Design a binder for this molecule. Structure first.
Ligand code: U7Z
Ligand code: ZN
Length: 259
């Protein structure tokens, strides 16, 4: 139904999911000088266990690592959140070249990729699916990826990409700690937004980290080697699987730091 191709891409999603034109859509272009410094915000804590990862999957839209979310062991708390949100999965958005790929932009600048750690309010909702539709249901932490030096921990993930190159394939992926993909700073920007893929529900509290992590061009290349297509189809590489910035519509972006 929807994708990132010329005929089914982001520019057309609004024809199938009208909420695409809503007042709290994501991603956005963060104008750093206009963010409101908010010291009242609590410190952001990403408390992640080392062995809660289950599998790695090419779902045709991105490569996603799923987690055991039966308890509150791997959660995000603090910052703009009232309580803990359990990590359900993480995935990425990337481009064909370095100048494009991320969903959020900062002062008009795009990064080659963006990592999304998707968490849900298990204290209020009974399931991730139920939470994905409520205003306070999800908390997504976004981390920008820049290309430069090789990222040691990333190797375990980029080396596994071959096994899920085709759409609809998956592999076991145990003991990968998502903390290894975080920068050494916990400063962030936060604003009320939405899922960046259909159904585009406005159920996400976005927490976009200020500091990007870096991976090598070789590692980035492993993502670009993935395919939107299945085994016996004409190969179309999975690239530019991102939604562009949406209207802010008067929302206020808060910052945990002074720029
Ligand atoms: N790019 S992003 O905003 O970080 C992001 C994060 C999470 C999701 C995602 O996992 N889903 C799948 C589940 N979603 C649903 O609306 C849903 C709920 C119940 C039954 C089926 C579905 Cl599709 C919401 C989208 C999709 C996109
Ligand atoms: Zn995403």
């Amino acid at each position: 139904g929807w994708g990132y191709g010329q005929d089914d891409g982001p520019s057309h999603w609004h024809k199938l999911y009208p909420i695409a034109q809503g007042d709290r859509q994501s991603p956005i272009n963060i104008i750093s000088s206009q963010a409101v410094y908010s010291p009242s915000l609590q410190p952001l804590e990403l408390s992640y266990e080392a062995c809660m990862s289950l599998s790695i999957t090419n779902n045709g839209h991105s490569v996603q690592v799923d987690f055991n979310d039966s308890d509150d062991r791997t959660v995000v708390t603090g910052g703009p959140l009232e309580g803990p949100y359990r990590l359900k999965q993480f995935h990425f958005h990337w481009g064909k070249k370095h100048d494009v790929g991320s969903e959020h932009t900062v002062d008009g600048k795009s990064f080659p990729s963006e990592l999304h750690l998707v968490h849900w309010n298990a204290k209020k909702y009974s399931t991730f699916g139920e939470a994905a539709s409520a205003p306070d249901g999800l908390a997504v932490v976004g981390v920008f990826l820049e290309t430069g030096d090789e990222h040691p921990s990333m190797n375990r993930l980029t080396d596994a990409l071959y096994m899920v190159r085709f759409k609809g394939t998956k592999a076991q992926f145990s003991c990968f700690n998502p903390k290894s993909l975080l920068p050494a700073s916990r400063h962030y920007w936060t604003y009320p937004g939405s899922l960046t893929t259909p159904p585009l529900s406005e159920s996400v509290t976005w927490i976009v980290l200020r500091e990007p992590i870096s991976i090598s061009e070789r590692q980035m290349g492993k993502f670009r080697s993935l395919l939107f297509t299945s085994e016996d189809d004409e190969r179309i590489h999975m690239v530019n699987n991102f939604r562009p910035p949406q209207p802010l519509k008067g929302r206020v972006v808060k910052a945990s730091f002074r720029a």
